[PDB]
Design an enzyme around this catalytic site. Structure first.
Site, PDB file in Angstrom:
ATOM      1  N   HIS B  72       0.450  -1.207   0.456  1.00 34.46           N
ATOM      2  CA  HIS B  72       0.209  -0.126  -0.023  1.00 34.46           C
ATOM      3  C   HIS B  72       0.765   1.223  -0.182  1.00 34.46           C
ATOM      4  O   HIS B  72       0.962   2.347   0.500  1.00 34.46           O
ATOM      5  CB  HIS B  72      -0.625   0.049   1.136  1.00 34.46           C
ATOM      6  CG  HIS B  72      -1.828  -1.246   0.736  1.00 34.46           C
ATOM      7  ND1 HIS B  72      -2.129  -2.301   1.134  1.00 34.46           N
ATOM      8  CD2 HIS B  72      -3.264  -1.381   0.154  1.00 34.46           C
ATOM      9  CE1 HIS B  72      -2.727  -2.837   1.397  1.00 34.46           C
ATOM     10  NE2 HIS B  72      -3.639  -2.017   0.397  1.00 34.46           N
ATOM     11  N   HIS B 112      -5.994   7.064  -2.462  1.00 31.08           N
ATOM     12  CA  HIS B 112      -7.693   5.907  -2.278  1.00 31.08           C
ATOM     13  C   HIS B 112      -6.673   5.147  -0.893  1.00 31.08           C
ATOM     14  O   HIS B 112      -7.767   4.891  -0.023  1.00 31.08           O
ATOM     15  CB  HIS B 112      -8.354   4.959  -3.053  1.00 31.08           C
ATOM     16  CG  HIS B 112      -7.268   3.956  -3.343  1.00 31.08           C
ATOM     17  ND1 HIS B 112      -6.430   4.315  -4.267  1.00 31.08           N
ATOM     18  CD2 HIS B 112      -7.517   2.638  -3.221  1.00 31.08           C
ATOM     19  CE1 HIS B 112      -6.230   3.251  -4.623  1.00 31.08           C
ATOM     20  NE2 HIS B 112      -5.956   1.895  -3.869  1.00 31.08           N
ATOM     21  N   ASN B 233      -4.657  -6.526  -9.521  1.00 34.67           N
ATOM     22  CA  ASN B 233      -3.570  -6.899  -9.515  1.00 34.67           C
ATOM     23  C   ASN B 233      -3.782  -8.246 -10.459  1.00 34.67           C
ATOM     24  O   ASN B 233      -3.298  -9.261 -10.926  1.00 34.67           O
ATOM     25  CB  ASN B 233      -3.128  -7.686  -8.378  1.00 34.67           C
ATOM     26  CG  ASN B 233      -2.837  -6.547  -8.138  1.00 34.67           C
ATOM     27  OD1 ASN B 233      -2.476  -6.184  -6.334  1.00 34.67           O
ATOM     28  ND2 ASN B 233      -2.388  -4.400  -8.306  1.00 34.67           N
ATOM     29  N   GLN B 281      -3.523 -17.078  -3.350  1.00 32.68           N
ATOM     30  CA  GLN B 281      -3.903 -16.594  -4.626  1.00 32.68           C
ATOM     31  C   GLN B 281      -6.095 -17.110  -5.431  1.00 32.68           C
ATOM     32  O   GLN B 281      -6.359 -16.449  -6.247  1.00 32.68           O
ATOM     33  CB  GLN B 281      -3.239 -16.628  -5.883  1.00 32.68           C
ATOM     34  CG  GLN B 281      -2.040 -15.298  -4.886  1.00 32.68           C
ATOM     35  CD  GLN B 281      -2.692 -13.794  -4.916  1.00 32.68           C
ATOM     36  OE1 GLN B 281      -3.067 -13.248  -5.846  1.00 32.68           O
ATOM     37  NE2 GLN B 281      -2.510 -13.889  -4.272  1.00 32.68           N
ATOM     38  N   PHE B 284      -8.722 -16.248  -3.749  1.00 35.31           N
ATOM     39  CA  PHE B 284      -8.709 -14.434  -3.543  1.00 35.31           C
ATOM     40  C   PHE B 284      -9.460 -14.587  -5.347  1.00 35.31           C
ATOM     41  O   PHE B 284     -10.327 -13.997  -5.449  1.00 35.31           O
ATOM     42  CB  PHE B 284      -7.108 -13.475  -3.842  1.00 35.31           C
ATOM     43  CG  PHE B 284      -7.600 -12.390  -4.366  1.00 35.31           C
ATOM     44  CD1 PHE B 284      -8.792 -12.263  -3.422  1.00 35.31           C
ATOM     45  CD2 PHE B 284      -6.280 -12.103  -4.466  1.00 35.31           C
ATOM     46  CE1 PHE B 284      -7.687 -10.684  -3.278  1.00 35.31           C
ATOM     47  CE2 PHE B 284      -7.160 -10.630  -5.395  1.00 35.31           C
ATOM     48  CZ  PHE B 284      -7.413 -10.000  -4.339  1.00 35.31           C
TER      49      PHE B 284
HETATM   50  C1  LIG Z   1      -2.221  -9.545  -5.048  1.00 37.52           C
HETATM   51  O1  LIG Z   1      -3.038 -10.711  -3.715  1.00 37.52           O
HETATM   52  C2  LIG Z   1      -4.106  -9.776  -3.540  1.00 37.52           C
HETATM   53  C3  LIG Z   1      -4.055  -8.176  -3.257  1.00 37.52           C
HETATM   54  C4  LIG Z   1      -4.855  -7.442  -2.786  1.00 37.52           C
HETATM   55  C5  LIG Z   1      -5.264  -8.675  -1.327  1.00 37.52           C
HETATM   56  C6  LIG Z   1      -5.645  -9.308  -0.675  1.00 37.52           C
HETATM   57  C7  LIG Z   1      -4.778 -10.244  -2.255  1.00 37.52           C
HETATM   58  O2  LIG Z   1      -4.339 -11.540  -1.989  1.00 37.52           O
HETATM   59  C8  LIG Z   1      -5.020 -12.777  -1.414  1.00 37.52           C
HETATM   60  C9  LIG Z   1      -6.396  -7.666  -0.167  1.00 37.52           C
HETATM   61  C10 LIG Z   1      -8.048  -8.487  -0.318  1.00 37.52           C
HETATM   62  C11 LIG Z   1      -9.166  -7.998   0.662  1.00 37.52           C
HETATM   63  C12 LIG Z   1      -8.690  -8.104   2.062  1.00 37.52           C
HETATM   64  N1  LIG Z   1      -9.664  -8.240   2.709  1.00 37.52           N
HETATM   65  C13 LIG Z   1     -10.786  -8.462   1.747  1.00 37.52           C
HETATM   66  C14 LIG Z   1     -12.175  -8.545   2.111  1.00 37.52           C
HETATM   67 CL1  LIG Z   1     -12.808  -8.680   3.913  1.00 37.52          CL
HETATM   68  C15 LIG Z   1     -12.907  -8.505   0.882  1.00 37.52           C
HETATM   69  C16 LIG Z   1     -12.399  -8.085  -0.435  1.00 37.52           C
HETATM   70  C17 LIG Z   1     -10.607  -8.298  -0.661  1.00 37.52           C
HETATM   71  C18 LIG Z   1     -10.402  -8.159   0.247  1.00 37.52           C
HETATM   72  N2  LIG Z   1      -6.680  -6.135  -0.115  1.00 37.52           N
HETATM   73  C19 LIG Z   1      -5.669  -5.229   1.105  1.00 37.52           C
HETATM   74  O3  LIG Z   1      -6.230  -6.269   2.418  1.00 37.52           O
HETATM   75  C20 LIG Z   1      -6.533  -5.521  -1.170  1.00 37.52           C
HETATM   76  C21 LIG Z   1      -4.984  -5.988  -2.741  1.00 37.52           C
HETATM   77 MG   LIG Z   2      -7.135   1.184   0.889  1.00 38.73          MG
HETATM   78 ZN   LIG Z   3      -5.933   0.264  -2.809  1.00 39.41          ZN
END
Ligand SMILES: COc1cc2c(cc1OC)[C@H](Cc1c[nH]c3c(Cl)cccc13)N(C=O)CC2
Ligand SMILES: [Mg+2]
Ligand SMILES: [Zn+2]
Ligand SMILES: COc1cc2c(cc1OC)[C@H](Cc1c[nH]c3c(Cl)cccc13)N(C=O)CC2
Ligand SMILES: [Mg+2]
Ligand SMILES: [Zn+2]
Lengths: 326, 323
Positions: B72, B112, B233, B281, B284
């Site tokens: 971030h 953001h 991503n 991943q 996700f």
């Molecule tokens: C490249 O891989 C990643 C990138 C990102 C995340 C997770 C990744 O890999 C597992 C999480 C996603 C996320 C965390 N909690 C969530 C909830 Cl509660 C709902 C929807 C999305 C999320 N992020 C921030 O922490 C955004 C970037």
């Molecule tokens: Mg954010």
């Molecule tokens: Zn962001």
């Protein structure tokens, strides 16, 4: 200590609608919130139940009371004390007997005590339109109410102020969520939606074997507490007329000072804030007809017939203000 | 330079070499990419923004992203900005958004995540942090990103909106708040539900172009657009995606180390001693990213096809790294 004598006698009325709250503010040396909260905590046995040290409670209450502005005519420690005491009476209504846990009762009373702390005497819209630091911090969203919460909770961290020191972690977490939900619901921009939702609950009301309201999930329980404290916050027109008129005098002074700031800045003056074109009596009749009576008629329906005398007083006060217009 | 100018010619393409741009610009990707996009969209002339004010604000904003946070940081901000910029050009969204709306979505993307500490909202709430106390446990980070992003406009020669009119500034501010608050991941499910509903009730021209008559629908699309960009991503060329995975896992593991040192329950995916990066991943993508992007692609059918194709290829590759 004749003065303390008289104060003690006046605090015997703490379970009554129409408590002489301005007299208590004078007799207690401008500590109405401290002495009314302490009286209510003893009356409800909250210090014993939550193992609150008396000296911690008094220290927190005095610091909380200090963070209301003594130079704001309406949104000051006397208003806080009044909303606390009114919430305390509404919590005792027969239709809610044994409905709420001790923790929910503690949340509603604490939320009432902090719900306007550090109020500057101007509205959310004024704070937004003037690009205030508060509105920058809170992104124009329930600006004052988010601030009241942050101050009320931050003060628990001052020395010998943590009145919740002996709650469990789950109790502290639950209390914090309920207090936030309640104070955010005191934002007047939420009133229409809050009332709409209360009407839906009245229309679908369920009552138990014992005749009390049945509230069996968090959403319904917190909705009733939100509307209870909102009713307490909007209770001035339901009080005996000598109390109501003093509250009207105070809100008008606060509004007029805001309007003077708007006029000086070349802004459009907010409704009811222009002392050169005010109709105080018509404004109270409109306030009752469009806001306060729709709310209290609905609350009275929820707890029928418990609140009938309160509603009767509101209707009499509306008739009295109306009669001063022609 | 020169190589940096060559890299910036792909500003309108999914898959910009944002890490290379970060390196070539002296760790100023947010400034050089925002400046490039404001030119490509003629935003400086449209909104009468002095170029030096723009640059001063951008450098100040970029300075308030933490350089010691693995994910971030300013490279993520630049990536989301550029991704939003591309999505705004979806042929299916042609004629939908005004120039003020375009400005709001791009500005929202840039600010953001500003001043992100590299830990989650839940961590901030459970450690009783000052931020959670300020914001009453509600969208803690996102409220702070907004407050910082707007407060920085008040620094010397930083008010890039100085020549917007009073109503334009008020309208932009509202839209930016609505968009950034929507990037709170706890709002993902509700946001996606509203996107699905819009897809079902979708009205289009005879050539398939979206017609959005009310502000509510338009801000929902802008909210989902910046959320898609934030969660883009896995839809990027694999060499880019794998770097983003490395970065988010490092950030998560550092949060998990703090949770361990404090004696807290370690957050999902945050335990470096019990992680499965690749399975995480795939999960996700399967549960969050692909449902979101499949719905976006239906809203803009069929213009998101190439992005969705890349996502599906990358999911297949990560699955194949699991034995
Ligand atoms: C490249 O891989 C990643 C990138 C990102 C995340 C997770 C990744 O890999 C597992 C999480 C996603 C996320 C965390 N909690 C969530 C909830 Cl509660 C709902 C929807 C999305 C999320 N992020 C921030 O922490 C955004 C970037
Ligand atoms: Mg954010
Ligand atoms: Zn962001
Ligand atoms: C005694 O008389 C008064 C007392 C109070 C008010 C107005 C009174 O007399 C007209 C206003 C009510 C209010 C302002 N905007 C509102 C919206 Cl938007 C919805 C519901 C209520 C309100 N208050 C604070 O500003 C609370 C106290
Ligand atoms: Mg208030
Ligand atoms: Zn109040």
């Amino acid at each position: 200590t004749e003065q303390e004598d008289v104060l003690a006698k006046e605090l015997e009325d703490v379970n009554k609608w129409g408590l002489h709250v301005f007299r208590i503010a004078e007799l207690s040396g401008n500590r109405p919130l401290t002495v009314i909260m302490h009286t209510i905590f003893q009356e409800r046995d909250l210090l014993k139940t939550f193992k609150i040290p008396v000296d911690t409670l008094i220290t927190y209450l005095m610091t909380l009371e200090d963070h209301y502005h003594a130079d704001v005519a309406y949104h000051n420690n006397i208003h806080a004390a009044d909303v606390v005491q009114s919430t305390h009476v509404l919590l005792s209504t027969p239709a809610l007997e044994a409905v709420f846990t001790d923790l929910e009762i503690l949340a509603a009373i604490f939320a009432s005590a902090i719900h306007d702390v550090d109020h500057p005497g101007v509205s959310n819209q004024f704070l937004i339109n003037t690009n205030s630091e508060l509105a920058l911090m809170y992104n124009d969203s329930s600006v004052l109410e988010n601030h009241h919460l942050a101050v009320g909770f931050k003060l628990l961290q001052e020395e010998n102020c943590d009145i919740f020191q002996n709650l469990t972690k789950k109790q502290r977490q639950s209390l914090r969520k309920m207090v936030i939900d309640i104070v955010l619901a005191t934002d007047m921009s939420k009133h229409m939606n809050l009332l709409a939702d209360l009407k839906t609950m009245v229309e679908t009301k369920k009552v138990t074997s014992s005749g009390v309201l049945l509230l069996d999930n968090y959403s319904d329980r917190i909705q009733v507490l939100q509307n209870m404290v909102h009713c307490a916050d909007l209770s001035n027109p339901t009080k005996p007329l000598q109390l109501y008129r003093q509250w009207t005098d105070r809100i008008m002074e606060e509004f007029f000072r805001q309007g003077d700031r708007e006029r000086e800045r070349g802004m459009e003056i907010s409704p009811m804030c222009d002392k050169h074109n005010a109709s105080v009596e018509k404004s109270q009749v409109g306030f009752i007809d469009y806001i306060v009576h729709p709310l209290w008629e609905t609350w009275a329906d929820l707890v029928h017939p418990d609140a009938q005398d309160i509603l009767d007083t509101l209707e009499d006060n509306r008739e009295w203000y109306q009669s001063t217009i022609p």
